Coordinates of C-alpha atoms (C1' of nucleotides) in Angstrom, one line a residue:
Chain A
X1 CA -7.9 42.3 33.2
X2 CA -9.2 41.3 29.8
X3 CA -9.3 37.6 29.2
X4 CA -10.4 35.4 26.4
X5 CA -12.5 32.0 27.4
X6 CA -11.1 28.7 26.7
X7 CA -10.8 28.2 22.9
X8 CA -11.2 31.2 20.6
X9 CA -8.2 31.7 20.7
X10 CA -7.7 28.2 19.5
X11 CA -10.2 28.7 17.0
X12 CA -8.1 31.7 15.6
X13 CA -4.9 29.4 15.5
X14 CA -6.5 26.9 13.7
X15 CA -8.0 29.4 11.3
X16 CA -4.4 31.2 11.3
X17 CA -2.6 27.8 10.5
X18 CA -4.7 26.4 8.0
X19 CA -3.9 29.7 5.7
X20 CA -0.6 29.7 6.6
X21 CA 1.7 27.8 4.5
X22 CA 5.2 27.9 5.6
X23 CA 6.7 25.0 8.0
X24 CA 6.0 24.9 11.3
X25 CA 9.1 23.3 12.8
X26 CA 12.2 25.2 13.3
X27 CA 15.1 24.3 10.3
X28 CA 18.1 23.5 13.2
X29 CA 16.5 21.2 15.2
X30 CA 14.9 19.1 12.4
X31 CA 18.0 19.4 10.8
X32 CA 19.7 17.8 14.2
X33 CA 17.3 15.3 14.4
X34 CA 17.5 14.2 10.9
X35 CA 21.4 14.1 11.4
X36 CA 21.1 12.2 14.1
X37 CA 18.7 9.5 13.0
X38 CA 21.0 9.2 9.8
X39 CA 24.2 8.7 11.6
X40 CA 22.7 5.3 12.9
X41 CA 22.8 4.0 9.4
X42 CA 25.6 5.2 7.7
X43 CA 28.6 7.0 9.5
X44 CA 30.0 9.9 7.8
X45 CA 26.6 11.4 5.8
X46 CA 26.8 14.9 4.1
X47 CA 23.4 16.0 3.6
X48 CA 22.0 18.6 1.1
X49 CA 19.7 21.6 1.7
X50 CA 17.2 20.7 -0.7
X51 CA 17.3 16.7 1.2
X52 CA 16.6 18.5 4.8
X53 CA 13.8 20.9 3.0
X54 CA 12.1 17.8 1.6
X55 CA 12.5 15.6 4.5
X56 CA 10.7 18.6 6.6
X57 CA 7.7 19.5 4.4
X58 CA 7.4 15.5 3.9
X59 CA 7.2 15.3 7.7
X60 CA 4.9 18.1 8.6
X61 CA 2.5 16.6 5.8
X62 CA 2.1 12.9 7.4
X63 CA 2.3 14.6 10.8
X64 CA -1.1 17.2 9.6
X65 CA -2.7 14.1 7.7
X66 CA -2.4 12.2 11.0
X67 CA -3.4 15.1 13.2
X68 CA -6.7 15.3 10.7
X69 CA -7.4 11.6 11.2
X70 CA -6.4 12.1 15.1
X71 CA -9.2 14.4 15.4
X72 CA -11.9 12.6 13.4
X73 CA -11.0 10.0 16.1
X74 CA -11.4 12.4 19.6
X75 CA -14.9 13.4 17.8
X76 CA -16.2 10.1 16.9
X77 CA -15.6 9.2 20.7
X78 CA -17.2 12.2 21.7
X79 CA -14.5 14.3 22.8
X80 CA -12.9 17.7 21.7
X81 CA -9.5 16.8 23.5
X82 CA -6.8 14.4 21.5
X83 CA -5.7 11.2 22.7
X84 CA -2.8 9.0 22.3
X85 CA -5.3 6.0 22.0
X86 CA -6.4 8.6 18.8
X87 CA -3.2 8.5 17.1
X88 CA -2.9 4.5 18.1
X89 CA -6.6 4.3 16.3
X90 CA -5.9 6.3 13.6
X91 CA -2.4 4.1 13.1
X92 CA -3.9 1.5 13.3
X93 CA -6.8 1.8 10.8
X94 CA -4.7 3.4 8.2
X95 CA -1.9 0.5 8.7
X96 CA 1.0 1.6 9.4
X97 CA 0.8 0.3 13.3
X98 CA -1.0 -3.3 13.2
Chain B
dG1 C1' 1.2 89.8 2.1
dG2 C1' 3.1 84.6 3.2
dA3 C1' 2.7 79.5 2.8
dT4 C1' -0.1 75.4 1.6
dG5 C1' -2.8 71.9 -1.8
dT6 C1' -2.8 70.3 -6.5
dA7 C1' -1.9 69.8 -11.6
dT8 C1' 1.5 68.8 -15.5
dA9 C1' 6.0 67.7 -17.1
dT10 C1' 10.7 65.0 -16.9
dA11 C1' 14.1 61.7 -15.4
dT12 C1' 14.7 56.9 -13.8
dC13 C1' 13.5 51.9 -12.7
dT14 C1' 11.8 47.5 -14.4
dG15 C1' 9.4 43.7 -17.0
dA16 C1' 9.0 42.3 -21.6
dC17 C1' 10.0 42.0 -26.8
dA18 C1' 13.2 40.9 -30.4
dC19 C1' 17.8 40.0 -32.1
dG20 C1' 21.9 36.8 -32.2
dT21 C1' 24.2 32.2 -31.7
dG22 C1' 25.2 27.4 -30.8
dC23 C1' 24.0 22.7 -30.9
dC24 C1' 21.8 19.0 -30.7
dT25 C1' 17.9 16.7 -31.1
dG26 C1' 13.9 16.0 -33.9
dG27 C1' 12.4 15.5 -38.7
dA28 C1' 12.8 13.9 -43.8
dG29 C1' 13.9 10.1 -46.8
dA30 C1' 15.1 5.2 -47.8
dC31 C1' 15.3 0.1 -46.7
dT32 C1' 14.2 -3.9 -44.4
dA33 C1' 12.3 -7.6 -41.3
dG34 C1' 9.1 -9.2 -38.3
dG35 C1' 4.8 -8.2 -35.4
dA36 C1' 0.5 -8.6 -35.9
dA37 C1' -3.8 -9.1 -38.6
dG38 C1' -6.4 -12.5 -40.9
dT39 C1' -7.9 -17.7 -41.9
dA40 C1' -9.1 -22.5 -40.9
dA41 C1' -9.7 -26.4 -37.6
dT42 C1' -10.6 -28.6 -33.0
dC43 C1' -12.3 -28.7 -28.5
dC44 C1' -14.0 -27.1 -24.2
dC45 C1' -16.4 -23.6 -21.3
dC46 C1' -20.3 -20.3 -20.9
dT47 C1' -25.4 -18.7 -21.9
dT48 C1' -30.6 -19.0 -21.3
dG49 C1' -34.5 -21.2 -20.2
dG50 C1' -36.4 -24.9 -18.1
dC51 C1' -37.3 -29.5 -14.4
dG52 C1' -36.7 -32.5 -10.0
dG53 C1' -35.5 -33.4 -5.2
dT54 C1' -32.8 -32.3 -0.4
dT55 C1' -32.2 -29.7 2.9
dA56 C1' -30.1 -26.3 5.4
dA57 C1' -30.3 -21.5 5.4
dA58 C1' -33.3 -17.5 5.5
dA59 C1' -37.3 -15.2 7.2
dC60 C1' -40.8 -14.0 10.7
dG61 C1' -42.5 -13.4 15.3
dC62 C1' -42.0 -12.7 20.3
dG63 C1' -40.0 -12.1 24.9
dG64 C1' -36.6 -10.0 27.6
dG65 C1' -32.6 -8.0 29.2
dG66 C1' -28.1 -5.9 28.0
dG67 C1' -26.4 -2.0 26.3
dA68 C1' -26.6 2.8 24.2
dC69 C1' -27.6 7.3 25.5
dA70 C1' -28.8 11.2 28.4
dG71 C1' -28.1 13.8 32.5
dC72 C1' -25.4 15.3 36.5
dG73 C1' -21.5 16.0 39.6
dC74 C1' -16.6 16.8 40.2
dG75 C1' -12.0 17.5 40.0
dT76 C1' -8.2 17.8 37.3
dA77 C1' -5.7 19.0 33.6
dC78 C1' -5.2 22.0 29.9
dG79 C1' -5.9 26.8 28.1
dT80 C1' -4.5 31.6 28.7
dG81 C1' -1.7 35.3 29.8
dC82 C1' 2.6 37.4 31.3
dG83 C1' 7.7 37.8 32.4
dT84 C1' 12.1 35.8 31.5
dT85 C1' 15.4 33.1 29.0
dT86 C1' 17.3 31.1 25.1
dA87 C1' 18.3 29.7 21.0
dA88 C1' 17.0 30.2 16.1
dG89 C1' 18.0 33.1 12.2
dC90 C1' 21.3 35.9 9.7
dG91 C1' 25.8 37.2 8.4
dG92 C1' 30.8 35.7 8.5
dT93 C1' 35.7 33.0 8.7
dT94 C1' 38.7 29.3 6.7
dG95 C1' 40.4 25.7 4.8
dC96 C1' 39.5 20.9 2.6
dT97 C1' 36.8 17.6 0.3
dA98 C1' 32.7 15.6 -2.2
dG99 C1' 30.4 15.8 -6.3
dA100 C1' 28.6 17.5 -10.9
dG101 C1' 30.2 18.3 -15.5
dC102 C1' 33.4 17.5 -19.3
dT103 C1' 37.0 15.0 -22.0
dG104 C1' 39.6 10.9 -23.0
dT105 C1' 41.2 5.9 -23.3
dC106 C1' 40.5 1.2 -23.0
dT107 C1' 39.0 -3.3 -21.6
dA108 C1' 36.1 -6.7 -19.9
dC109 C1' 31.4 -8.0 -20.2
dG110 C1' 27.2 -8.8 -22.3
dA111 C1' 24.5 -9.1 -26.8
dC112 C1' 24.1 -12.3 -30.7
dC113 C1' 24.2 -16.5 -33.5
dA114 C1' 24.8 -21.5 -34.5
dA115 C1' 24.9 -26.4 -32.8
dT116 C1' 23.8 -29.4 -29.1
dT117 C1' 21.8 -31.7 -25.6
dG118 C1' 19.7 -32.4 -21.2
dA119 C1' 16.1 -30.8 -18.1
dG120 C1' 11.0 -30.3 -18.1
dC121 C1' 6.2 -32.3 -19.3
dG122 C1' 3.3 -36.3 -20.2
dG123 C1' 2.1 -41.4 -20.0
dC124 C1' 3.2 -46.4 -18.6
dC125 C1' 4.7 -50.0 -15.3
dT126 C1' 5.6 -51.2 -10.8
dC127 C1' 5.5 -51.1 -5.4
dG128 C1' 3.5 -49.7 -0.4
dG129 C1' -0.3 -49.9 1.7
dC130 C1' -5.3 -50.7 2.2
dA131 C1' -8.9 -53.7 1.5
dC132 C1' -11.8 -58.3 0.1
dC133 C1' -12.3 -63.4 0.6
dG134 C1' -11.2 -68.2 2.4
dG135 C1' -9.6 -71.2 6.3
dG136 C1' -8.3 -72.5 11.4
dA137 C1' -8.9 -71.7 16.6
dT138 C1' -12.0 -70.3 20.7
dT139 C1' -16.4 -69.7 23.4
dC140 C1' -21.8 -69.6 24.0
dT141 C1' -26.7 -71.6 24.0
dC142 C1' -29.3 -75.7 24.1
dC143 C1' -31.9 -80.7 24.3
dA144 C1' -32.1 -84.8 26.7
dG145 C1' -31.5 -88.4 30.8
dG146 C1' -31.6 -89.3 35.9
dG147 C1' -33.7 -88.7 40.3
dC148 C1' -37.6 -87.2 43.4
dG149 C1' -42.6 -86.2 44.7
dG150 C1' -47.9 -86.8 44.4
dC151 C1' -52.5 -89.6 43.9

DNA sequence: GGATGTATATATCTGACACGTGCCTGGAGACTAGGAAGTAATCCCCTTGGCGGTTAAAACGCGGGGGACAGCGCGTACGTGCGTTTAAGCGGTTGCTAGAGCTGTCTACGACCAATTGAGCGGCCTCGGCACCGGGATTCTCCAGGGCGGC
């Protein structure tokens, strides 16, 4: 049985994803989600294609951007494995937690 | 002797160039008012190079221990791969409504201008409170007289 070790194949993702430039959430549920969260403001919201589009790529950008910083944070602590204390750091020193 | 590889010619597809038209927005020409450039005066802050004295911060050295880092073990949690499910993606129905665009009318609301005056800025006088000076009441230290002992 042929096998691959633990994190080539990550390393071809990465270099897959990073040449890649379409969006890597799926429309219909982003589309639900952002449906959802709007109904909490303001009952009765049509929505646009073009508003969902932006909504997404404006969303995967801050959620890549914070991935980047996420990872700058596992390496400065000497780790190759992400943490929710990296996102909380990352948050925290870019300001939009604390 | 038959069929296969390859060259040249002809029809068709497709991006690009030029022609046409509207229209509306930018440009040309003229006039005017005020924004800003320039001028003079006054006054206060900043510059550069000094001096003097205080003093607390900065610098230096040294001992020591707390913490950073390296190494090792371990166990668990995440990566990887495969089979199965499921839901995204596409195409489609069917009506109604929201909204952009366009046209039209009108009316209330805000710009604008003149006269007015009352709220904002500065100084002056006074009070509330804190402080300086004079006088009365209370408590502490001291000098002298009386009595006792010794030669």
């Amino acid at each position: 049985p042929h096998r691959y070790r633990p994190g080539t194949v990550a390393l071809r993702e990465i270099r897959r994803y990073q040449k890649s430039t379409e969006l890597l959430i799926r429309k219909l549920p982003f589309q639900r989600l952002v449906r959802e969260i709007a109904q909490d403001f303001k009952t009765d919201l049509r929505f646009q294609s073009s508003a969902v589009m932006a909504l997404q790529e404006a969303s995967e950008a801050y959620l890549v951007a914070l991935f980047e910083d996420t990872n700058l944070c596992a390496i400065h602590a000497k780790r190759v494995t992400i943490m929710p204390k990296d996102i909380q750091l990352a948050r925290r020193i870019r300001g939009e937690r604390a």
